[PDB]
Design an enzyme around this catalytic site. Structure first.
Site, short mmCIF file in Angstrom:
data_model
loop_
_atom_site.label_atom_id
_atom_site.label_comp_id
_atom_site.label_asym_id
_atom_site.label_seq_id
_atom_site.Cartn_x
_atom_site.Cartn_y
_atom_site.Cartn_z
N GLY A 44 0.83 -1.23 0.00
CA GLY A 44 0.00 0.00 0.00
C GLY A 44 0.86 1.27 0.00
N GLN A 49 2.78 10.09 0.60
CA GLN A 49 4.04 9.47 1.06
C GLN A 49 5.15 9.74 0.06
OE1 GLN A 49 1.61 5.75 2.07
NE2 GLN A 49 3.59 5.46 3.11
N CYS A 90 4.46 0.27 7.47
CA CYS A 90 4.38 1.51 6.66
C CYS A 90 5.78 1.84 6.14
CB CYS A 90 3.80 2.69 7.44
SG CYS A 90 3.59 4.19 6.43
N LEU A 91 5.86 1.96 4.83
CA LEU A 91 7.02 2.43 4.05
C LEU A 91 7.50 3.82 4.54
CD1 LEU A 91 6.02 1.13 0.54
CD2 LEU A 91 7.53 0.15 2.29
N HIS A 132 -5.73 2.56 6.64
CA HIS A 132 -4.32 3.01 6.84
C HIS A 132 -3.98 4.05 5.76
CE1 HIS A 132 0.05 2.41 7.91
NE2 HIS A 132 0.16 2.82 6.64
N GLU A 133 -4.29 3.80 4.49
CA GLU A 133 -3.92 4.73 3.39
C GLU A 133 -4.78 5.99 3.44
OE1 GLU A 133 -1.17 4.12 2.18
OE2 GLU A 133 -1.09 2.00 2.81
N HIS A 136 -3.31 8.48 5.70
CA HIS A 136 -2.19 9.23 5.06
C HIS A 136 -2.76 10.47 4.39
CE1 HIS A 136 1.37 6.87 5.82
NE2 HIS A 136 0.74 5.76 5.48
ZN LIG Z 1 1.53 3.96 5.55
#
Ligand SMILES: [Zn+2]
Length: 170
Positions: A44, A49, A90-91, A132-133, A136
């Protein structure tokens, strides 16, 4: 490869603006994000991000790089009170995993890369990942549901991993 912003870059706190029309740039950008996401690797990624504050989310839950999915101007509604715990990553908080408690079934209302609307109902991994996204897009990180010890251990440890990503480029 697009650089991924890293906790605590304050740019991750930017609330994303809605996509006006799905241009050919939005298409290229979304392809840029799939590649970034698949290289990390990860399942994701929000445009937030990669420092592009528009309502664009790229996803692939598959054990290969084979089931790609796009959400543009998403709206997600819980369908119940039930929450399920899940160990999230998370990246933008690389390396770190903790358990977060999110609604279990949600309704997803979004636009695809052709400019068509769709309404889907989601459980399991998909319900975890859009929520989660979505966060962001509202400048929220899964670290905001952890205690400040857990948070500060993440802050110091991500700086550590980031400086090492740089020393590997050397
Ligand atoms: Zn994330």
């Amino acid at each position: 490869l697009l650089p991924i912003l890293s906790f605590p870059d304050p740019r991750l706190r930017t609330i994303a603006k809605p996509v006006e029309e799905v241009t050919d740039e939005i298409r290229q950008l979304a392809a840029d994000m799939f590649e970034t996401m698949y290289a990390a690797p990860g399942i994701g990624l929000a445009a937030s991000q990669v420092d592009r504050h528009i309502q664009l989310i790229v996803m692939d839950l598959s054990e290969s790089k084979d089931e790609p999915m796009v959400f543009i101007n998403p709206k997600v509604t819980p369908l119940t009170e039930e929450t399920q715990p899940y160990e999230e990553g998370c990246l933008s908080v690389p390396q770190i995993y903790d358990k977060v408690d999110r609604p279990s079934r949600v309704k997803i209302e979004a636009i695809n890369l052709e400019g068509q609307a769709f309404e889907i109902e989601a459980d399991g991994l998909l319900a975890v990942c859009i929520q989660h996204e979505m966060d962001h897009l509202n400048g929220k990180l899964f670290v905001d549901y952890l205690s400040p010890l857990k948070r500060q251990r993440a802050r110091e440890k991500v700086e550590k991993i980031v400086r090492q990503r740089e020393r590997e480029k050397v």
